[PDB]
């Protein structure tokens, strides 16, 4: 808020949620993925309360932003975990699924492909941990136009640029890389929209048991 760039980075690194573990049909894979998402969601709320400036928003706003962003946030986390595993998605350390295991679930392989493509892009860019936590906080604060928030968002942009300057990038390279990173958020929004439709269709089929928390987070999107 009055934080220095390095303080913001330290704050965001310290706030990071834990990496959770998992415990195959359409039903079982969806069971593991949704079971995992549900447990991760509990940790996401605690993380969100530690994003500098977030708890200064009203409760209503806090709920709104989390309801809007949760699947984007799960997805950027996944893509980050998967970055050093070309062709695979590291849902958890004991659930590392390669591209073809996504065919077990109807409609899933196309989503796997988008996540894998994003992970490739991160790898091509050599995305850094400090950049990643800035991006994930931007997603939380941006995703739900549905002044204090804009100032926190500007602060995180300052923090990304600080990281790049510290890395030795020229001003031209800083601005180019900033744009490249933020354009990836458009792709992450697209994947969340698609993933939300998919989750909705699995609920409606009533194949897989979905947790009450997960049903409420899904419901917020209609």
């Amino acid at each position: 808020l009055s934080l220095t760039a390095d303080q913001m980075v330290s704050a965001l690194l310290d706030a990071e949620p834990p990496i959770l573990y998992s415990e195959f049909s359409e039903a079982s894979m969806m069971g593991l993925l949704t079971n995992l998402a549900d447990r991760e969601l509990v940790h996401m709320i605690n993380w969100a309360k530690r994003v500098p400036g977030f708890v200064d928003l009203t409760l209503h706003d806090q709920v709104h932003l989390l309801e809007c962003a949760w699947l984007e946030i799960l997805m950027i986390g996944l893509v980050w975990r998967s970055m050093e595993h070309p062709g695979k998605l590291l849902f958890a350390p004991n659930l590392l699924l390669d591209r073809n295991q996504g065919k077990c679930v109807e409609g899933m392989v196309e989503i796997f492909d988008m996540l894998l493509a994003t992970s490739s892009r991160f790898r091509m860019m050599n995305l850094q941990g400090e950049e990643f936590v800035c991006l994930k906080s931007i997603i939380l604060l941006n995703s739900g136009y549905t002044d204090h928030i804009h100032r926190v968002l500007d602060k995180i942009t300052d923090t990304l640029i600080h990281l790049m300057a510290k890395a030795g990038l020229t001003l031209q390279q800083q601005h180019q890389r900033l744009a490249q990173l933020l354009l990836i958020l458009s792709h992450i929004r697209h994947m969340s929209n698609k993933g939300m439709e998919h989750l909705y269709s699995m609920k409606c089929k009533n194949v897989v048991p979905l947790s009450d928390l997960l049903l409420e987070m899904l419901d917020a999107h209609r």
Binding site: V42, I45, A48, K49, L59, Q62, V63, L66, L213, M217
Partner: peptide, 8 residues
């Protein structure tokens, strides 16, 4: 509603 309280 869960979210409302959890955040509290």
């Amino acid at each position: 509603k869960x979210l409302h309280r959890x955040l509290q």
